[PDB]
Amino acid sequence: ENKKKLEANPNSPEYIWEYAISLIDSKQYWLAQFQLEKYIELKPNSEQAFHQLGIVSEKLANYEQAFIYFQKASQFAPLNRNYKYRMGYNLEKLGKLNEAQKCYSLVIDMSHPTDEVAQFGIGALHAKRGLWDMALSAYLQHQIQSNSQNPQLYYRIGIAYERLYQWTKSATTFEQAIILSEIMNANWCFKCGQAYERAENFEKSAEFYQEAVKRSDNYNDYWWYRLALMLEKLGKYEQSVVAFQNSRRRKLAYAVNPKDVIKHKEEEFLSYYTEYYETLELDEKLVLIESFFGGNISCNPYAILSYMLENNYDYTYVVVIKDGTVIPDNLKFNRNIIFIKRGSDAYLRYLCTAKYLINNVSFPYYFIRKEGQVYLNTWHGTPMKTLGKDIKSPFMDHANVSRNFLQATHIISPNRHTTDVILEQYDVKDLFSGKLAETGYPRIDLSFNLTDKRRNEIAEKLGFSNNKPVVFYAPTWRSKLQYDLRKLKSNKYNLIFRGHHLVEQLLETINLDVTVAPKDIDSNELLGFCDLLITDYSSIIYDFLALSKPAISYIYDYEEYDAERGLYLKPTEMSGTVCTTITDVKKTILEHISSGKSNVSEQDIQKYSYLDDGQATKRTVEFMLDKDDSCIYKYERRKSDVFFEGPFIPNGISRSFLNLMASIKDSGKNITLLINGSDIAQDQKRLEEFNNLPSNITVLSRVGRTPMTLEELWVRNKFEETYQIYSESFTNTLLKVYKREVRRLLGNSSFDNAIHFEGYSLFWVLLFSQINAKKHIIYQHNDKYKEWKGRFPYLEGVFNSYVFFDQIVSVSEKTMENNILNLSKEFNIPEIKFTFCNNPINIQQILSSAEENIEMESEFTLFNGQKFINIGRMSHEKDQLKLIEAFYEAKKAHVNIRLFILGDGVLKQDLINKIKDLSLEDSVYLLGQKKNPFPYLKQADVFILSSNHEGQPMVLLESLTLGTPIIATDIVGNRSILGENYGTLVENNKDGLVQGINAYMEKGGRKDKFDPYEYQNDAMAKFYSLLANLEHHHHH
Ligand SMILES: [Zn+2]
């Protein structure tokens, strides 16, 4: 490329070496030979010079001079292995076979015993240079000499055959490496199908192309394309089209570009899933198995997979694994089992194609059960600590589990205790539209039916030559375990321990009689293998009680663990022998080993283990395939109404929602509330307002992003940017997002009424329009047109979405007509859709707050003539300056008067400044912010509201139920609640408030005849009139 003979300045080793290497890199070997001879004349001790001369002489086919040069280089660094190999190669090319073989032997003996030349011979170093004829010969020699059966060696042999264009030998060799493999490799299956194609065996080529795409974790369009070609050559045109259609990750005509649409990586990942969800067909002979997020293959899903394997069920099985997941022995060398990694492309496709899904915890947030899919959630044990909706530690942490139960069609239980706890503590009893059957855990079958074969294999895999008793210690995650395992050192029994992968790795096993159970052995097999079980707070004890063996509940830290996790059971009512010290554990072990007595109470077996007869897996499988209804827990579901309040900001909307919740709490219905848990967990005051809900409220929280296709992301982003109605197809595309999201959150649930109570959040307006309900209702708490043009642009999208609801309910009749005037004609909403419903009040709490809470009251209210009260925020909208000015004028005519103000705010200091101006320091008192103002509101004589803007003046009704009358400025908020019949209204000026004070002092409080129960009965009757009859379920 470059001459570099440019520097004709001679005799310089630097320039000579520069020119020589440039000649070698340009493959001008004969020309570089003379320059390296000149360098050796100058520096006759450069090891690199002898290295290059050996390379040059070998490229020049001077094999004798190559050996001489490589030898002179090797004695410059006898620890260099590449030199010794090149010595042997050039001797082999020379014909000196024996001298070369002694060289190869030195190369082998001086190599680390897992470097490739150790397990695969000297041919691996030929392969590193592309010398495939010599690599194949050495591979074949090393296989025959070692009788090796390593699949990796057969793979390297097939690679050599492939680069020699001996395709038939390459294909058959790859098939051996695959057959000899513990788990079939997707990459190997492609190399085998590729070689079979080049050999023109199309049936074998299609066979292994099919294997490759079935087991490929990542999407490979190339492999789908090659499979489709081979299927076409075979004449299978239908399957050829399917593979051709799948030769593109995205099949749909989105008419949009992914680069301009996708903002976040999660959006791209979810877009592939959503297409798979909508387009891929279910395989009626496919079963997916997942246990503990693929971290291991154990528990109930493993027992079901094992049962259906040994009974030869006609299925293909997909087992979900992670990196480094240990594989049980009975699953190796099985072509009917496909291992795919969680979260991969194959994971998403198989979640959308497997007809039968089996899990013991939960699928991730994006999983949606397709129609015709069977999802069996087995769970993973009898619960013993605080669990689910009572765990406040991460807010709404159980939400995806409650989601998964709503996605499930079948659920199994080990005992009625677990049935009650799961259905109640995950808030899904009335919503769960599937089937729950009490079959007992199939994992217990692995303990009952341990074979003498497997028992002997576990014994030799452990190192137990004698039939000494086996003691199994399996505690839960939370040093003492070191002290406890020394104290249990004994020759009388074999001690087996299983704990957390972290605990077992830093155990220091010497000085210990203990054996850490290998991770390839199931815990239920260990229960049937052992003779005595030691545990503390693990649900594995209830797998044990039906095995007629002694158990020990060793609970040294019951105080600490109960304080942290809250245990269901007291110490005296746990199973087996309850021990609090380690010396008592050893004493109890030897007592029971010698006596042979059982120590498990039969009352415990009747509570938790009455279903364990070693046949639960047949019951579960027949239940899942809808062939055995004998174990179903049939019960009556309540009808359900679903609500949305918002993010529970403490405001007028939340206070009205809480009052409505208190009024309907004993209606015999399931009141469901949908929330966004992340929007509430941030604010301490939002959580406090959320915690005031009645305890019977079923609560579901959205988890994660909404899965959307490519065009669905564009359509949504466009709508949430322009808020316009565009066409029928555009609207249907947008609404398809929210019907899918309703399914993701609720499954096949159905409700009587879906009530969007907030009326603001656009996401929840479109979502509630798609809930399967008999009636869809959305509230209006304000003048929506003023809120739209004042603060919230997205309210335009809400107005263009009122078409998707049946009723639009305002919180007052005045507000209703205002909303009709501003929205009905402008947005094509029929007048008949609009209605109103007065906000409910909690009469019992108002009455209880005023009469109870005998609290510290200022001495200046306790003694006076006429008392006037006002609660506000000093936000200028309350306008307390016009109040104190009307007071100064009203003190003239009548003087035996006092006034009190509650609250705090910005315009505070200006109030105390005005206190001295009117010289009323002893006639007006500015009390603090009171956490319970109802004692003051009852004991006062007049409640004054001088406000200029009032949104939800509910204190006005509150005071009137307490029997203390009202004077309030005639603004739109105070008139919407009072009108002309309740309370006394005045103009919004100083003179109007003085007239109201003076009119009260002559004539008294207005004789409005306000009945709090009449207002409550009217408000609730209007509410119940808005609900549905026995009408038909639908979505919009
Ligand atoms: Zn409807």
Numbering used by the authors: 100 to 577, 588 to 1145
Original paper wording:
Capsules are long-chain carbohydrate polymers that envelop the surfaces of many bacteria, protecting them from host immune responses. Using Actinobacillus pleuropneumoniae as an example, we demonstrate that CpsA and CpsC generate a poly(glycerol-3-phosphate) linker to connect the glycolipid with capsules containing poly(galactosylglycerol-phosphate) backbones. We reconstruct the entire capsule biosynthesis pathway in A. pleuropneumoniae serotypes 3 and 7, solve the X-ray crystal structure of the capsule polymerase CpsD, identify its tetratricopeptide repeat domain as essential for elongating poly(glycerol-3-phosphate) and show that CpsA and CpsC stimulate CpsD to produce longer polymers. The polymer backbones of App3 and App7 are composed of related poly(glycosylglycerol phosphate) structures ([→4)-α-Gal-(1→2)-Gro-(3-PO4−] and [→3)-α-Gal-(1→1)-Gro-(3-PO4−], respectively) and both Cps3D and Cps7D require the alternating action of a CgoT and a CgaT domain for the transfer of Gro3P and Gal, respectively.
The crystal structure of Cps3D in its unliganded form was solved by molecular replacement methods to a maximum resolution of 3.0 Å. Cps3D (maltose-binding protein (MBP)-Cps3D2–1138-His6; Supplementary Figs. 1 and 8) crystallized in the P 3 2 1 space group with one molecule in the asymmetric unit, and the electron density maps allowed us to trace residues 100 to 1,145. The Cps3D protomers build into a physiological and functional dimer (overall size ca. 170 Å × 95 Å × 70 Å). Dimerization was confirmed by size exclusion chromatography. The dimeric architecture is assembled primarily by an extensive interaction network between (1) the two TPR (α2–α15) and TPR′ domains and (2) the TPR domain and the N-terminal domain of CgaT′ (CgaT′-NT). CgoT adopts the typical GT-B fold of glycosyltransferases consisting of two Rossmann-fold domains. The CgoT and CgaT active sites are located buried between the corresponding two Rossmann-fold domains, including the essential residues for catalytic activities.
